[PDB]
C-alpha cells in the first residue's frame, strides 16, 4: 500500500466531498453519539468507468489507515454455484471483527444489475445476500462499504433503498485542470523535452479518462520508442527520455476516448468577456444563480422564492450558449448542457427515462445549470402538445425545490409553437429575449477571436464591426473562420515555393478580412425579427 | 428492545388507525367471540421506503407487549435453495407457540412481486409457502402478520385476496407538522443553538421522509463538525451542540429528496384567506364537500346522494387550485393533486394502469378531494385513453366514501361529451376571472409570509387592476420582489466596497412592475366562457 491523494486526483470537489464524508471513523470514534448516526452506511460511486475509482477508495483507506481489503466483484460471479456466497460473507465477517474497515466492491453491475438483468436464480440470491449482509451491518463498529457503478439506473434499486447505499458522490470526469493534474502525475514517471507545458494537451483533449490519459502518456513514450531505430539491447533511451509536443499531438490524433458523448458536468472557462451588452439582463442572470448561492440571507429576508431559470428565445446563435457557460463560470458552479439532438433522442428513439437521468445528474451535482437548446425542434418536427419530452421536463422541474438550486436555461428559435404551459407562473416563465448582438457584443466577439490566435497590426476589426451590424456574432465567428481559411490557404503555400525551389507570415491581414466579408451570408431575416419584437406588446394586465 | 410508542410519530391518523386495529390482542382476548372474527388477518403496509415502518411495528408491538420477531424478507432469499423454508415455517411456528405474536415482514417485494415477474419456480414456491402459512393461521390464538410493502400493485394480487393480507392502512409520507414531529424526535437526542424553532426548517422540506430527516439532523451536526478548525481528540466537539439555522438550510441545500415526484396526500395549509368572493359558489362548494361528511343524518333523510366532484373551467388561474386545497383544509380532509403533466404522461407514453392505483390511493385516503388540472391538454393534443379510465373509476365508486374529483379546464367544450351527463361530474362551474374582493385576498396572500411596513398602496394597484387577473398580479408581486431585492443588494454593497436591508417593497417598485404584465384572458375568450351562462329559463 503506497498510494496517495494526488495519483488519481484532479476531481478536487468530489474528492473533498468524500474526504469530508469518510473521515468520521478517522480520529473520531465516539463522535457518532454526538452526530446521532453516521451518514456513511454505504457509498455509491457512479460515473464513466475505469476513472480510478478503485484507486480513489484505496487512497481514502490509505489516508484513514483503515483495513481496505478490496473484493473483486465479478469474482463472486466467477465462483461456482452454491459457494458463490464465499469471499463475500467471509469478507464481511472479516470486516466485522476488523473495526476500521472501508469495504470497496467493484463492478456492482456484475453483482447487482437492473431487474430486467436479474434472470436466473443464483444472481438474485447473490444480490439478496449482499444487501442482507449490508443492513445486517447496521452500526457494527463503524464499517461502511463502497461500490463502483456505471449509473444508478443500471443497478438494482433495492440496494438503492435508503438506510443502505444512501451516499451518491458522482466522481465522473475531470476538467482541463484535473486532466492537467492527472497528466502531470502520470508524467512524473517520465521526462519530457519541455516543448509543451501539458496544459495545452489537457485543454486540447476532450472527454478522456485518467486511465485514458495514462494511455496517452504510454503512447507518447511508445512514440519515443518508435522514433529511434532498434538499439542493440540499449540504455541509451533510459537516460534520454525525450517525448515531444509532436509525440503528444500525434498521440491525441491516434487515441479514441471511451467517456466521449457522455454529458459533461463541470464548470467551463469563458470568464464573461465573450459577451457584451444587456447590462441589466446580464446582472439578472448573474444574480439569479449567484445570490441564491452567495447571499441566502437576502432571499431569507424576503421569502418569495425566485424562478429557477430562464428561456432565451431569439435568433439562432452561440451567444446564448456562451452566455450560459459564462454564467456558470462567474457563479463558479457546475454546468450540464443538453442540446437539440439529445432532446430529439427522447422523441426519436423513445427513452424517456433519460430526462429523469439528466435531472437526477443535475440534482446530484448541485449547484448546477441545465442548459437546454433547440426545444422547438420536437414541436416543429411535429408541425412539419409536449410529445414525451416537454411534459417530462415539466414533471422534473415541478419536483425541484430552490434548495439544490438546479438552473434551467432554455434556448429557442421560435417562441410561438414551443409550449403554452411554460408561459404560466409556477412553471419556468422568464421570456428573456436576447436580441441580435450589437456593436459592443461584436467587439467582445472580436476580443474572443484573439483567444488562441496570434494577433498583430493592420487588421481593421472596428471597420468590420461597424459594417456588420446585421451580421450576428455567431456569423461573425463564421466569417472569422472564413478569414482563417483564407489565411491557411496561403500561409504554408508561401513557403512551399521555397521547397519547390530547393517566412510563415503568421498573421491575418485586411485583404483576407475583405474577402471573408465578400463570401459569406447572414443568419437572420427581418420577418423573424418582427415576431421577435412581437413580445414588446407586453405592457399591461 | 428500547423503542417506545412515542419514539415514532408524524402519521397521527395512520398511527391512530393501526393502534385501533392491532389492539384486539391487547387486554381483550375474549372479545373475539363478541366480534365473531378478528378483523386483522394480515395488515398490509404500503408507502415509500425509509418511513420507519419497522420502527412503527416495533413500537406498536412494544405498546402491545407482544412477541414481535421481525424478519426481513430478502434474508429468506439469501438462504440456500430447498432449505429456504428456514425462517418461514420456523418463524410462523415460532409465532404459533406464542399467542401475542405480531409478525413483521420487511421488503415483501423482494419475496412476493407480481407473479409473472417471479421467473423460475423457487420464487413462487416461497410465495406459495408464505400464503399457505397465511391462511394456515386461521385464528390460531390471535396471531396476525404485518408486511412492509412498497406499493399495492407491486406485490402479487393473489396475496391481497380477502382472507389473507386484506387490511390496507396507507401509511404514506408525513405532512409538514408530521415532519416537525419527526424533527423534534431526531433533535430530542441532540441540541441546537435555538436560532430556529425547527418549524421554519420543517415547513418546506417537501418530499422528505424519516430517513431523509435523519440525514438532515445528521448532516447539520456534520456541518457543526465542519465548522471547527481542528480539535485534537478533545470534549469541545461534544459539549458545543450548537447547530444553526444556517447549518439546517445548508443541510436542506445538500438534501437529496427520496420520495419527491410522488402523489402527496397531506392536508393543505391554506385556511381560506387566499381566495375570497363568490359567495354562492363557496356556499355550494362547502355544502357539497363538508355536509356529506359532517352531516350524514341529513343525507340519510333523503336518498339523492350528490355528485362525487365538480368541474371548474374558465381562464387558467391558480385560484381554483388553491380553492380546491382550501376546501379540503376547511373540511380537514386529505388532498391529492393530479396535475396536467401527470395526466399527459399516461396518454402519450402508455402508463394507463396507474390510474387504477391513484384512485386506489384516493379510496384509501378517504375522506379526500382530488384536484385534476389541465384535462383539455390531452384533448387539445389530439390535433396537436387515460380519461376513459377516470370515467370508469368514479363510476366504480360508491355513493359514500368521498373522493371528490375537482377538474381544471381551459376550454369547457373540448373536454368530454360524457362528463356533463348526470351520474358523472355534471356540476359545471364557471370560476370566473378574479374580481376586486378576490384580488384583495390575492393581496392578502402577497403580504402573507412577507416583511411589511408603510409606503404601501396595494389598494391603488387593486383599482389599477380592476377587470384583470390575480395570478398575474401574483406574478406582479414576484416581479416587484425581484425589483426590490436587486436594489436591496446595492444598499449593503457600499459597506463592502468603501471598506440597512430596507425590508419593505416601495410603491415605485410596484408601479414599475405594473408595466411588465399582460392580459392572460381575452375578451372573446371571456365571451366563449360566458356563452355557457345560457342555462336559464326553459
Curated annotation (Swiss-Prot), chain A:
Residues annotated as binding ATP 2: 317-322
Q: Where on the chain is N6-succinyllysine found, per UniProt?
A: 457
Which post-translational modifications are recorded for this protein? Phosphorylated by tyrosine kinases in response to T-cell antigen receptor activation. Phosphorylated in mitotic cells. ISGylated.
This protein's superkingdom? Eukaryota
**Where does this protein hold ATP 1?**
49-55, 150, 186
The observed outcome of changing residue 34 to E is:
In IBMPFD1; increased ATPase activity; no defect in ubiquitin-dependent protein degradation by the proteasome; impaired autophagic function; defect in maturation of ubiquitin-containing autophagosomes; decreased interaction with CAV1 and UBXN6
Main subcellular location:
cytoplasm
A single GO BP: positive regulation of Lys63-specific deubiquitinase activity
Question: Residues bearing N6,N6,N6-trimethyllysine?
Answer: 117
Q: Which residues carry this modification: N6-acetyllysine?
A: 298, 301, 457, 531
**What disorder is listed for this protein?**
Inclusion body myopathy with early-onset Paget disease with or without frontotemporal dementia 1: An autosomal dominant disease characterized by disabling muscle weakness clinically resembling to limb girdle muscular dystrophy, osteolytic bone lesions consistent with Paget disease, and premature frontotemporal dementia. Clinical features show incomplete penetrance.
**Known function:** Necessary for the fragmentation of Golgi stacks during mitosis and for their reassembly after mitosis. Involved in the formation of the transitional endoplasmic reticulum (tER). The transfer of membranes from the endoplasmic reticulum to the Golgi apparatus occurs via 50-70 nm transition vesicles which derive from part-rough, part-smooth transitional elements of the endoplasmic reticulum (tER). Vesicle budding from the tER is an ATP-dependent process.
Task: Indicate the quaternary assembly.
Answer: Homohexamer. Forms a ring-shaped particle of 12.5 nm diameter, that displays 6-fold radial symmetry. Part of a ternary complex containing STX5A, NSFL1C and VCP. NSFL1C forms a homotrimer that binds to one end of a VCP homohexamer. The complex binds to membranes enriched in phosphatidylethanolamine-containing lipids and promotes Golgi membrane fusion. Binds to a heterodimer of NPLOC4 and UFD1, binding to this heterodimer inhibits Golgi-membrane fusion. Interaction with VCIP135 leads to dissociation of the complex via ATP hydrolysis by VCP.
Protein's name in the database = Transitional endoplasmic reticulum ATPase
Source organism: Homo sapiens (Human)
- Gene responsible for this protein: VCP
**Whole sequence portion shown:** 199 to 764 of 806
Amino acid at each position: 500500500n503506497e498510494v496517495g491523494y494526488d495519483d488519481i486526483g484532479g476531481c478536487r470537489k468530489q474528492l473533498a466531498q468524500i474526504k469530508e464524508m469518510v473521515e468520521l471513523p478517522l480520529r473520531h470514534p465516539a463522535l457518532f453519539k454526538a452526530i446521532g448516526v453516521k451518514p456513511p452506511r454505504g457509498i455509491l460511486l457512479y460515473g464513466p468507468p475505469g476513472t480510478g475509482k478503485t484507486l480513489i477508495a484505496r487512497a481514502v483507506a490509505n489516508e484513514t489507515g483503515a483495513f481496505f481489503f478490496l473484493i473483486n466483484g465479478p469474482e463472486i460471479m466467477s465462483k461456482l454455484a452454491g459457494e458463490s456466497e464465499s469471499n463475500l460473507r467471509k469478507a464481511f465477517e472479516e470486516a466485522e471483527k476488523n473495526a476500521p474497515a472501508i469495504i470497496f466492491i467493484d463492478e456492482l453491475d456484475a453483482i447487482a444489475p437492473k431487474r430486467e438483468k436479474t434472470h436466473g436464480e443464483v444472481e438474485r440470491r447473490i444480490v439478496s445476500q449482499l444487501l442482507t449482509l449490508m443492513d445486517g451491518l447496521k452500526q457494527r463498529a463503524h464499517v461502511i462499504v463502497m461500490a463502483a457503478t456505471n449509473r444508478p439506473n443500471s443497478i438494482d434499486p433495492a440496494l438503492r433503498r435508503f438506510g443502505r447505499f444512501d451516499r451518491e458522490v458522482d466522481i465522473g470526469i475531470p476538467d482541463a485542470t484535473g486532466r492537467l493534474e492527472i497528466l502531470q502525475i502520470h508524467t512524473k514517471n517520465m521526462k519530457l523535452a519541455d516543448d509543451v507545458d501539458l496544459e495545452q494537451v489537457a485543454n486540447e483533449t476532450h472527454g478522456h479518462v485518467g486511465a485514458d490519459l495514462a494511455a496517452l502518456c504510454s503512447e507518447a513514450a511508445l512514440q519515443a520508442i518508435r522514433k529511434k531505430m532498434d538499439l542493440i539491447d540499449l540504455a541509451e533511451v533510459m537516460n534520454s527520455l525525450a517525448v515531444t509536443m509532436d509525440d503528444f499531438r500525434w498521440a491525441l490524433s491516434q487515441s479514441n476516448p471511451s467517456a466521449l458523448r457522455e454529458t459533461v458536468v463541470e464548470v467551463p472557462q469563458v470568464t464573461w468577456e465573450d459577451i457584451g451588452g444587456l447590462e441589466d439582463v446580464k446582472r439578472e442572470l448573474q444574480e439569479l444563480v449567484q445570490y441564491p448561492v452567495e447571499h441566502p440571507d437576502k432571499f431569507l429576508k424576503f421569502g418569495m422564492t425566485p424562478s429557477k431559470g430562464v428561456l432565451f428565445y431569439g435568433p439562432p446563435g452561440c451567444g446564448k450558449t456562451l452566455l450560459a457557460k459564462a454564467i456558470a463560470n462567474e457563479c463558479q458552479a457546475n454546468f450540464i448542457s443538453i442540446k437539440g439532438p439529445e432532446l430529439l433522442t427522447m422523441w426519436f428513439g423513445e427513452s424517456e427515462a433519460n430526462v429523469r437521468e439528466i435531472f437526477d445528474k443535475a440534482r446530484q451535482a448541485a449547484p448546477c445549470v441545465l442548459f437546454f437548446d433547440e426545444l422547438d425542434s420536437i414541436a416543429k418536427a411535429r408541425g412539419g402538445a409536449a410529445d414525451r419530452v416537454i411534459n417530462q421536463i415539466l414533471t422534473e422541474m415541478d419536483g425541484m425545490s430552490t434548495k439544490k438550486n438546479v438552473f434551467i436555461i432554455g434556448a429557442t428559435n421560435r417562441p410561438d409553437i414551443i409550449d403554452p404551459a411554460i408561459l404560466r407562473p409556477g412553471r419556468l416563465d422568464q421570456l428573456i429575449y436576447i436580441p441580435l448582438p450589437d456593436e459592443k457584443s461584436r467587439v467582445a466577439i472580436l476580443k474572443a477571436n484573439l483567444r488562441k490566435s496570434p494577433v498583430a497590426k493592420d487588421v481593421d476589426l472596428e471597420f468590420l464591426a461597424k459594417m456588420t451590424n446585421g451580421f450576428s456574432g455567431a456569423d461573425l465567428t463564421e466569417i472569422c473562420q472564413r478569414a482563417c481559411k483564407l489565411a491557411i490557404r496561403e500561409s504554408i503555400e508561401s513557403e512551399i515555393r521555397r521547397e519547390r525551389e530547393r517566412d510563415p507570415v503568421p498573421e491575418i491581414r485586411r485583404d483576407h478580412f475583405e474577402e471573408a466579408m465578400r463570401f459569406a451570408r447572414r443568419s437572420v431575416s427581418d420577418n423573424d425579427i418582427r415576431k421577435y419584437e412581437m413580445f414588446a406588446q407586453t405592457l399591461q394586465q
